[PDB]
């Protein structure tokens, strides 16, 4: 069976002052914090009951610093607990010495009770009592003021009843290290109004002044600049951090040319720091891109000219040039949560401003699962968050539907948000929509349109601009044109 | 109660220098390792002390290689922890002794702590210290050199804040069996300058150099061209090996023939070695088609041609000509696995670089599956697989669902990759997708187009030159024409 | 600002039938408490001629959700 309950006069008990605590004689004998000496040496015995006044269980001390728990401790044990059912304002405290001195400093004449576990049962004890605590109008928290102890203040109130917790701030560790010659006052002011809280997410306006301010000069109105088409810019006025820019089109390699340029742009002639999540392609293949793109050369589309930089040492020469400033950092393959925790990775460990994602189409590992339709949905939301959440630039690459009317995507027909894939969560958690078009049968095979279908930020919307393709260099350049 | 914390001078303490471990006694003394003797015997104490400066716990030690653990050892326990609150790199080590190495050969100026249960526990020890390791610039985890110490760094980096994890890399087990006569130089360009990583698949470019550098010659560019229409080459840039070329198209004999002359100029005029699966005919049928394809004459299609040239020797002139440079090689028939296993083995036995295909519609054998939808997407796969694991050229060919809307094939009606069979897989698994489109009652019933629908390696696509169907010799010839 | 957005407890189906069980919730808030709750949300897309954007006007059958803030 279990450790007997300790017998009062069995074991040489006196009710006496706690000299070394500043705690009274008459203190220790109301909370029921008694003085045996079994078997030789002197122990200190806590006596916790339950509400109905019995003594279900003790926990026992010797001096130096050891224990002896008797009867059965229940996961609900408070030290106190039977000394009050009711009252306007309950403190509860760590451990039973500093129950022992709120006790004083009150001449015994209001609620207090310690954890029954305190220290790390902090959310148990707690919980297991929600009834007994919601007895009071406010429940005040006097834990300790170190790490674990603001922590078991959290993880209290948070399993504690509504709106009447509040948390106790102490100058030294505990309650008891004030009144051993400190500041009793300080004790005082806290158990008559306390601060008020957990809040850990809520945040009154008043308090954001600070960081509003900094926010208005650091973060910017003609975020980042679309390259290779003012118009792009002039209508969405850039691609501002924490949105999220969804470029779509037809067939549109286009498209990914045009990622790839903004990319190139972006993480040269601005400083940022651009990732790549390249789904379609190795990583070594877009590097190459790149490479190319950079000295207007198609270079992968080249048996010569590759073999002719790696030997006149153009190659190590012009990789270095792009390369060489650790701005470009590629996700490179072979899930859904398992690609996002990499994205974010580069957000929030080599920290990059931007992050491109070419080809939201490519889910992506944990198959049992229906619709592409719904879960397209699921994923642009986590990337929305982490967007938002991190202020990482989220430019996302999309392709589309094929009509079923009439006129193709490379007979050039327009696209609008309807035109559009998905369900709805990209039609929505996208910022800005960049739509590129080609009628890569007609008048101008190399000529491309851009549609802006949608800009938060600003509203000012639609054709934006016309590029055109250099089949030779490989660029999406800038055009002259418009009725 | 836990077991007391061990009193100095209760237990007889020394800070005296561990002799045999080459730390100071100096440096014992800053980090809290002592040498006390209870009862006897003489334990080596470890304080374990929170941010706080208070003493938690204690790790002690007995000669043999026993412990005992005092107080209570919180799961997130860092030896030396309260020695730094702030600084621009700490040192993390595996073990109490290691720490007290980096605290040396520093001359005990700059962080280092020791995980808490170390070995095991490096993913709890460390999540749980997020915020008191985010206090420092860069956090460099020096564990073991070992299978589970490695592991322990992985673990530990996962849990660990954003792009501040270097993982040391020592000469030896740990930083101390390096110390204990050998490399303290070695221990130290580490602590400095040891290099960064932990993202298993992120990749920043500029670590890309030399991998790019070795691709850019290896692989290439104008790998083994179309033959009969210059057009597909000069759109595709060829069959690159490890591609996956798919033709395809309506009722396409032309198809077969596209593919077959392929088959013959790659094997003869070009060196490659071809091996072909034609799962619709017969080993000796297709052997027959060749030799009559390579001489111009539709061998198996007369009666006449064939009696005369067995008589006449020229069959086994003819046969020898072609054939007889061991470099056609076919797959002959009467599963799935079963059938990707014989094709490999043409790759990896007999060495073919390029493998073709007929047609892919064909499944067989493992009778109780559904969709021919989905399993034509789970073979499209493997296959894949086979051709960029091995490197061997894929040609695949593949025919066409049949519209239900107005035009049928034999009209012409042009062909996209939505009009493509499949549900996705060679949708997307196929490198370069060329289709043949025959309108067989009209203008041209014998003039054939050839739509590029798709090509990775350069995304220049569309219509790319036309053939003209020769009745007489069987053969496609190439053909002048265009709008 | 715009309840579509529910988020945080992940391996469960229709945001149609979740949609709901936080409404009840959020008119228990409102009414256990007396505090004016209002609840921004956004609409379907028709399928039917003219968009949204065309004015077309909305009615609570071409409400969201599957009937919760139709009601509470």
Chains 1, 2 share one sequence.
Not at 235 to 247: F, P, Q, S
């Amino acid at each position: 069976m279990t450790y007997n309950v300790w017998n009062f006069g069995e074991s040489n008990g006196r009710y006496s002052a706690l000299t070394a605590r500043g705690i009274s004689k008459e203190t220790c004998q109301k909370a029921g914090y008694w003085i045996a000496k079994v078997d030789g040496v002197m122990y200190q015995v806590a006596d916790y009951r339950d509400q109905n006044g019995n003594i279900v269980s003790q926990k026992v001390r010797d001096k130096d610093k050891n224990f002896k728990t008797t009867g059965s401790h229940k996961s609900d044990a408070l030290f106190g607990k039977h000394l009050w059912n009711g009252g306007k304002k309950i403190v509860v405290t760590e451990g039973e010495i500093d129950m022992l001195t709120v006790m004083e400093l009150q001449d015994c004449k209001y609620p207090v009770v310690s954890l029954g576990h305190g220290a790390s049962a902090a959310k148990k004890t707690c919980a297991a009592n929600y009834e007994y605590f919601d007895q009071f109008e406010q429940i005040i928290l006097m834990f300790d003021m170190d790490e674990a102890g603001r922590k078991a203040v959290e993880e209290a109130a948070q399993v504690l009843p509504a709106g009447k917790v509040r948390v106790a701030v102490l100058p030294c560790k505990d309650a008891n290290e004030c009144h051993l010659n400190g500041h009793d006052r300080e004790i005082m002011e806290q158990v008559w109004n306390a601060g008020p809280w957990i809040p850990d997410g809520v945040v009154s306006a008043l308090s954001l002044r600070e960081r509003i301010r900094e926010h208005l000069s650091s973060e910017e109105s003609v975020g980042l600049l679309f390259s290779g088409c003012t118009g792009i810019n002039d209508k969405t006025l850039g691609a501002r951090g924490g949105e999220v820019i969804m470029v779509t089109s037809g067939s549109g390699m286009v498209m990914s040319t045009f990622v790839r340029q903004q990319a190139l742009q972006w993480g040269t002639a601005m400083g940022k720091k651009v990732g790549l999540a390249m789904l379609e392609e190795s990583v070594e293949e877009t590097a190459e891109d790149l490479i190319g793109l950079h000295n207007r050369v198609r270079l992968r589309q080249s048996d010569s000219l590759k073999r002719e930089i790696i030997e006149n040492g153009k190659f190590d020469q012009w990789f270095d040039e792009l390369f060489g400033n650790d701005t470009f950092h590629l996700y490179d393959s072979f899930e859904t949560d398992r690609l996002l925790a990499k994205l974010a990775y580069m957000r929030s460990g080599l920290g990059c401003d931007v992050i491109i994602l070419d080809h939201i189409s490519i889910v992506v590992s944990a198959s049992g699962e229906s619709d592409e339709r719904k879960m397209i949905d699921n994923l642009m939301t986590k990337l929305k968050g982490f967007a938002k959440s991190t202020g990482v630039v989220l430019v996302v690459i999309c392709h589309l539907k094929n009509p079923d009317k009439g006129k193709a995507h490379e007979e050039g027909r327009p696209v609008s948000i309807t035109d559009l894939r998905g369900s709805g969560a990209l039609r929505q958690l996208s910022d800005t929509i960049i739509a590129l078009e080609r009628n890569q049968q007609g008048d101008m095979p190399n000529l491309v349109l851009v549609r802006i279908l949608k800009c938060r930020f600003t509203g000012d919307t639609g054709i934006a601009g016309y590029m055109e393709y250099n089949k030779e260099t490989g660029w999406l350049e800038p055009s002259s044109y418009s009725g």
